[PDB]
Design a protein around this ligand. Structure first.
Ligand SMILES: *[C@@H]1O[C@H](CO)[C@@H](O[C@@H]2O[C@H](CO)[C@@H](O[C@@H]3O[C@H](CO)[C@@H](O)[C@H](O)[C@@H]3O)[C@H](O)[C@H]2NC(C)=O)[C@H](O)[C@H]1NC(C)=O
Ligand SMILES: *[C@@H]1O[C@H](CO)[C@@H](O[C@@H]2O[C@H](CO)[C@@H](O)[C@H](O)[C@H]2NC(C)=O)[C@H](O)[C@H]1NC(C)=O
Ligand code: NAG
Ligand code: NAG
Ligand code: NAG
Ligand code: NAG
Ligand code: NAG
Ligand code: NAG
Lengths: 1276, 49, 50
């Protein structure tokens, strides 16, 4: 027959080539294979085309561009235009606008203040020949839901960029994030840190099992670690040993920690420290959980704590005698030998010699026995001619937890070797098996493999011989293309053939091979494979260096060898504090897995398969036998499935799809230089390798690490690894100390000077004290006899600072001559710079207690200019040279309102209550996202869908009269709900306010609440709730009625006629009842009065109540907020204080909400307190979306939205600024729509703040000013 | 806003009975059955809780 | 688990509408002694005579 097979990796990755391979054979070489790649809706077409000869394989390396949308279904139709035969056949395929991988490697582990945060970032297309491409943004978010620095709107030219941002000496601390987004919305992170601490002069490490098991009475554990140049250190050791989850309550004075022993020790002078244990006391049993530990040790004369949390997730297991398979034979067939190596180990992880097994196969009803080789390896073999389902089993003991499994309270198990193999569906009666090398793979190498084939009747007619074809695949692409054959026998089923195929690079970290043959008879077979192609790079690369150096040995170098025209990441670190805490996600494996679509494998979610309409539904099948028998649905292996496993696709009419019938439905010398960076730069490799000239740092002996990454178009990327270069000085003075003291308070410093070489020498350290401190010793009059190797005796001291900032400290040692008293001799001839005088850094504060000193003031030019002056001036009991203050300048809607805003975007299921919770709040965030101006008409239109469906499903649960309950239909006789219906009228208001509604709904519901009116009273809930929290309130008609008046006065573009004023009337009534008293929870009811009177505009009355609230202040240290008693007069419950939603973000919003209201404008005091209480809002939000109810979420989002609707207008993006202080020290600023929110962290030199504001232009701004200044001169 | 709520079923007299769910005619509905509103401090409506 | 182990002693198993019924209600705990004057809560129910 005419035969063609057309192999295509089944996602279409853009901005790089697309190499799908293709075959022809046996008929019509005058043919034009062509993959037409069309988005028929409208009309795209990225035609692919090629011509070739019969019985050869070739590959068209076309490509794809950016697209209509991101990720899209693609019906790629292949066309093969022969001279006498036509053909046409479609499919479905996928294309995603390439969404790259980018990242950051921050400088170091753990940072001090005062430093330039420098970093980089990368991106590549699928062919990792990297890709210079435009960049939307390059910034950092400050921990508090805010930003501190930025780069923006550049593009890579070297495929890279490096940065810098000198941090202050008194900035914030904690966690930090250089966050970055890719233009199509995709954004992600690389967090990091800056804290304060004191440095290490070493690191050490545990010895311990990561795996202790059941049958254990002790634990091989010890303490072995490094030092300066990996040397020996003297000191003292200690473990933190502990089990988890004993019977204590972890509460009420109790701890979840289970057993915990105690083992300290001395530090030996050679090697490492060893302390082992017992493990009976621990009760390694049913419900005493895994072991979690640390171990920490001192270095003498320096007093160090060394915490490390590791070797922690250990396997105190249940299964012992844990064997496994290694060499599976994935499939079983009736005409083949399959026989897989099977090792066996367990537990600790080394095999026994010569331990027995038990062998079993079923239906093949096999039975046998074996024992272990050196590693248990056995290559058992079976004969096959049996029913369609294999199910194997092998043991050395029996099927049960034999001791005591019928007691439920044990700690044990044992394995069961389990493996399933399915069979080819081969009407050909031919197939292939392999002998793969299914274990560790060498690259830059190659290894030969055999495999085992067969031929049903050989060439039935066919022709003489065949070639067998294979694709070496990569990343759901194609790295290579190959084939091989040889002369056959005439009609025979041979099996011998070998293959070795290249392992250089250019391929994914799988060798997901399949080698397949095919015939002229509408027939095809091939055998998939899979391997761990361990890490291999298109350009391997390393760093190195001529051997390491000593303390003043400033001379240094590099040796990196990569692609010959190529740019790179080249770091180098004083790895003291990066051997303290690690880096994270940094290796060639990082470069790999950071790839999205690591193993592009199998059809994803959206697509199922091709559907072929083979329906073999005979009425009776004529399955000829002693009793007839109908059709069925199998479960066996297929070749369709081989390629679906592989991932790629083709377009052919061979024998692949089984005749699986269609469902019937049934039938009827040392100079200290700055550490904190040794390298981070770019030297570029020429055609003989690069050579950076590093330069070593003196006056500190510590550890070193190479941060690395590389790039170029020519050779593909690469990964080097760690240079480490630990310094050393045969005579060094080492000054150690705490880090956290102040000029106010004294402290001490213990400077040791060591010896490690065979001469023992008299030596006395000294200092050259300063005015910045005041240093005089404790035992200098002592005559230090001498120090031998690791000889270190250390006199005491005491000292305080006086100077402020990045001050330094000095000691000095020097070996001494001609005092032969202690040792056998004292020549004392180290190098010409024998004397070590090491100056080391430190950062001090001014004495005592800096405190909180802040204010909220704010203004907004509306067609004009607003300005202010104000005092940051209160020096009572001030001390010299300590105060330091600041404002910071930006707007207040983009700070931390990305996550929640785009998150809470939802779709309907449930009864009227949660039906509304899933419908309504989407409207407030719709407005909130639109008001910010960072929206999209797609979320909009799919939100039209949201709104229609959710609206309609609200009507699923409403009343036949107009009203609304939770249930509605099928419950005819009923009455709706009051607070519910208030919410529904409110949100009907706003939802019409965005899109079309019908007027009758608001009509009939507004008048429902209107008739909810007998003579006088303030009505209550018609209690039919299913949930007391959906209404955050506390059930009093007070705040209910106040909900009515606000929700019925906010009146967007409709009318609110009768119902709402008498709500104001009862509101005044309850106000009389309350304010005539003094307690209504003191925040909640009267704040609702505030916002009720506000959207009413009872100006004196709203003012009185919100002003009482202003007296009843619960404000925040950086903001404002209000709280119900929090120790409530009635007794409270246990879990979240039930029966009481606590309604803070709803009430505090309803506190926030009174101020913004005035139909022209309120005061700017309202805007100040608003951004205060909204700092509190956004801080009171959590990572999911919304807040702890639906009420608080709705009303928060709306408060925020209309705060904006006040402060936001499209063309109003022109807010200009100045300060005006008389000390020639002021500042001009500007704020707009596109420089719309950069924080301007800015400080001031004057003790007082007499800095007169000015603000002109369009749009409002949020500033926040405060001071830190120390106190406490004497306080006798 | 009136309510006859104590924490249990609460009928006195001669029977254990949660507040005996009735369906009959009182005078607030006899204000409804003509068509007018009015205002009244007095006790015209039944004690449903 | 149960601690703060008070006791009814001279309880009444009836109550009526022309009567005081007064539960001389013990309290002890644990080793078998009560605190000197640990304040408590006597809740009425449908009297809310707490
Ligand atoms: C929410 O989305 C709307 C999308 O339309 C944003 O734009 C608003 O659209 C209206 C359309 O009428 C603008 O009205 C304008 O009025 C002027 C003067 O009559 C006229 O010359 C324009 O052609 C236009 O009709 C409106 O100014 C504009 N902004 C609003 C409504 O404030 C809107 O910005 C987004 N914000 C909201 C409403 O949440
Ligand atoms: C202690 O010595 C160190 C190292 O010399 C000082 O650090 C730098 O010193 C140079 C001297 O010109 C200054 O220009 C730099 O600004 C210093 N580093 C910084 C802060 O970037 C350190 O300042 C000295 N401390 C004091 C004040 O005694
Ligand atoms: C291939 O081309 C030849 C010559 O036109 C023709 O005889 C043959 O039938 C073609 N392949 C088909 C139709 O199987
Ligand atoms: C447009 O649509 C037709 C539909 O048959 C398709 O064949 C063609 O490739 C598409 N693109 C072009 C080239 O117009
Ligand atoms: C480890 O523990 C075993 C006992 O299980 C003990 O005999 C041995 O001396 C210890 N040391 C090592 C590393 O074998
Ligand atoms: C294991 O099974 C084999 C049968 O294949 C039997 O000959 C042998 O005796 C059994 N095990 C022993 C006891 O060696
Ligand atoms: C396995 O045993 C079966 C028993 O019928 C036999 O037909 C087949 O040839 C054997 N295969 C071998 C010898 O590997
Ligand atoms: C009951 O009143 C007393 C004072 O008579 C008071 O000490 C106590 O706290 C109140 N309730 C309790 C037991 O908490």
């Amino acid at each position: 027959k005419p035969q063609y097979m057309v192999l295509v990796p089944s996602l279409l990755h853009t901005e790089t080539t697309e190499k799908g391979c293709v075959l022809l054979s046996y008929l019509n070489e005058t043919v034009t294979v062509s993959a037409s790649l069309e988005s028929v809706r409208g009309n795209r077409s990225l035609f692919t085309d090629l011509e070739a000869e019969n019985d050869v394989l070739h590959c068209v390396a076309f490509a794809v561009p950016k697209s209509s949308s991101n990720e899209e279904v693609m019906f790629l139709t292949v066309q093969v235009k022969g001279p006498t035969q036509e053909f046409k056949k479609r499919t479905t395929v996928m294309v995603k606008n390439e969404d790259s991988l980018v990242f950051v490697q921050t400088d170091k582990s753990i940072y001090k203040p005062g430093q330039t945060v420098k970093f980089r970032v990368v991106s590549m297309d699928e062919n990792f020949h990297p890709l210079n491409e435009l960049i939307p943004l390059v910034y950092i978010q400050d921990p508090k839901g805010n930003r501190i620095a930025q780069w923006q709107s550049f593009q890579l030219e070297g495929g890279l960029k490096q940065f810098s941002f000198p941090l202050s000496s008194e900035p914030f601390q904690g966690s930090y994030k250089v966050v970055v987004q890719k233009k199509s919305g995709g954004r992600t992170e690389h967090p990091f840190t800056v804290e304060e601490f004191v440095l290490p002069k070493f690191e050490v490490q545990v010895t311990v099992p990561k795996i202790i098991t059941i049958l254990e009475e002790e634990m091989n554990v010890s303490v072995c670690g490094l030092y300066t140049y990996g040397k020996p250190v003297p000191g003292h050791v200690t473990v933190s040993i502990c089990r988890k989850y004993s019977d204590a309550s972890d509460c009420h004075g109790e701890d979840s920690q289970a057993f915990c022993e105690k083992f300290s020790g001395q530090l030996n002078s050679h090697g490492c420290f060893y302390q082992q244990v017992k493990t009976k006391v621990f009760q390694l049993k049913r419900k005493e959980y895994e072991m979690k530990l640390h171990t920490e040790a001192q270095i003498q004369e320096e007093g160090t704590v060394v915490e490390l949390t590791g070797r922690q997730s250990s396997e105190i297991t249940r299964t012992i005698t844990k064997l496994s398979f290694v060499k599976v034979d994935s499939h079983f067939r009736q005409g083949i030998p399959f026989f897989g190596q099977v090792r066996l180990v367990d537990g600790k992880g080394v095999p026994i010699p010569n331990k027995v097994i038990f062998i079993r196969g079923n239906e093949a009803n096999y039975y046998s026995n074996a024992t272990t080789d050196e590693h248990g390896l056995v290559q058992f073999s079976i004969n096959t001619t049996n029913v369609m389902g294999t199910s194997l089993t092998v043991r050395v003991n029996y099927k049960d937890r034999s001791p005591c499994y019928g007691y439920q309270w044990v700690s044990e198990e044992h394995e069961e070797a389990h493996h399933t193999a399915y069979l080819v569906f081969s009407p050909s009666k031919s197939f292939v098996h392999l002998e793969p090398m299914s274990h560790e793979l060498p690259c830059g190498h190659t290894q030969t493999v055999q495999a085992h084939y067969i031929l049903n009747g050989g060439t039935l007619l066919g022709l003489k011989k065949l070639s067998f074809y294979y694709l070496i695949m990569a990343k759901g692409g194609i790295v290579r293309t190959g084939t091989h054959g040889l002369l056959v026998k005439q009609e025979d089923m041979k099996g011998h053939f070998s293959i070795s195929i290249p392992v250089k690079s250019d391929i994914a970290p799988v060798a997901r091979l399949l080698i397949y043959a095919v015939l002229p008879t509408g027939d095809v077979i091939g055998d998939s494979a899979k391997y761990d192609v361990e890490n291999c790079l298109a350009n391997k690369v390393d760093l190195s260096f001529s051997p390491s150096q000593s303390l003043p040995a400033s001379h240094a170098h590099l040796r990196v060898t990569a692609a010959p025209q190529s740019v790179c990441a080249l770091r180098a670190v004083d790895q003291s504090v990066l051997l303290m805490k690690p880096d994270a996600e940094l290796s060639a494996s990082s470069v790999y897995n950071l790839l999205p679509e690591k193993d592009l494998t199998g059809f994803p979610g959206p697509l199922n398969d091709q559907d072929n309409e083979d329906c073999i539904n005979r009425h009776n099948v004529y399955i000829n036998g002693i009793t007839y028998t109908p059709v069925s649905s199998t479960n066996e292996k297929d070749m369709y499935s081989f390629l679906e496993d592989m991932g790629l696709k083709a377009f052919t009419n061979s024998k692949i799809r089984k005749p699986k019938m269609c469902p019937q439905l049934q039938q009827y010398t040392v100079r200290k230089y700055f550490p904190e960076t040794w390298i981070w730069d770019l030297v570029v490799v020429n055609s003989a390798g690069v050579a950076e000239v590093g330069v070593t740092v003196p006056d500190t002996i510590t550890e070193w690490k190479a941060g690395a990454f590389c790039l170029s178009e020519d050779a593909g990327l690469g990964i080097s690894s760690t240079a480490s270069l630990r310094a050393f000085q045969p005579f060094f003075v080492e000054l150690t100390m705490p880090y956290s003291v102040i000029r106010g308070e004294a402290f001490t410093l213990k400077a040791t000077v060591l010896n490690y070489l065979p001469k023992c020498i008299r030596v006395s350290v000294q200092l050259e004290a300063s005015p910045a401190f005041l240093a005089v010793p404790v035992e200098k009059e002592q005559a230090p006899h001498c120090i031998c190797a690791n000889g270190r005796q250390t006199v005491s001291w005491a000292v305080t600072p006086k100077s402020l900032g990045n001050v330094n400290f000095t000691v000095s040692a020097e070996a001494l001559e001609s005092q032969e008293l202690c040792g056998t001799e004292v020549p004392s001839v180290p190098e010409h710079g024998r004397k070590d005088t090491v100056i080391k850094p430190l950062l001090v504060e001014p004495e005592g207690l800096e405190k909180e000193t802040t204010f909220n003031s704010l203004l907004c030019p509306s067609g004009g200019e607003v300005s202010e002056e104000l005092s940051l001036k209160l020096p009572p009991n001030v001390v010299e040279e300590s105060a330091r203050a600041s404002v910071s300048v930006l707007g207040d809607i983009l700070g931390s309102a990305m996550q929640n805003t785009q998150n809470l975007l939802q779709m309907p299921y449930g009864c009227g209550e949660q039906n509304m919770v899933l419908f309504a709040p989407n409207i407030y965030v719709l407005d909130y996202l639109n008001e910010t101006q960072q929206l999209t008409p797609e979320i909009k239109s799919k939100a039209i869908g949201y709104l229609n469906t959710g609206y309609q499903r609200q009507l699923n649960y409403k009343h036949y009269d107009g009203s609304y309950s939770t249930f509605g239909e099928r419950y005819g006789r009923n009455q709706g709900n009051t607070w519910l219906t208030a919410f529904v009228l409110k949100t009907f208001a706003q939802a019409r306010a965005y899109i079309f509604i019908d007027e009758a709904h608001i009509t009939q519901a507004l008048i429902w609440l209107s008739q909810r009116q007998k003579d006088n009273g303030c009505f209550r809930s018609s209690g039919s709730l299913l949930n007391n929290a959906i209404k955050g309130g506390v059930e009093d008609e007070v705040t209910l009625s106040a909900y009515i008046t606000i929700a019925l006065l906010e009146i967007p573009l409709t009318v609110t006629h009768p119902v709402v004023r008498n709500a104001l009337f009862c509101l005044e009534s309850a106000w009389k009842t309350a304010q005539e008293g003094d307690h209504g929870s003191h925040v909640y009811t009267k704040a609702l009065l505030a916002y009720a009177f506000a959207l009413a505009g009872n100006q004196d009355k709203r003012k009185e109540v919100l002003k009482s609230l202003n007296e009843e202040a619960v404000k925040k240290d950086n903001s404002v907020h209000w709280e119900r008693p929090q120790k409530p007069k009635a007794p409270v419950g246990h879990f979240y204080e039930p029966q009481a939603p606590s309604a803070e973000v709803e009430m505090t919003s309803y506190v926030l909400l009174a101020y913004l209201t005035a139909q022209p404008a309120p005061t700017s005091e309202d805007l100040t307190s608003a951004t205060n209480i909204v700092k509190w809002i956004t801080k009171q939000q959590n990572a999911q979306g919304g807040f702890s109810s639906t009420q608080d979420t709705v009303v928060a989002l709306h408060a925020l939205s209309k705060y904006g609707a006040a402060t936001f207008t499209r063309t109003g993006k022109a807010a200009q600024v100045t300060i005006q202080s008389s000390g020639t020290f002021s500042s001009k600023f500007q704020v707009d729509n596109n420089n719309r929110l950069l924080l301007q962290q800015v400080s001031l030199p004057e003790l007082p703040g007499e800095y007169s504001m000015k603000v002109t232009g369009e749009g409002c701004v949020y500033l926040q000013t405060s001071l830190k200044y120390n106190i406490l001169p004497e306080k006798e």
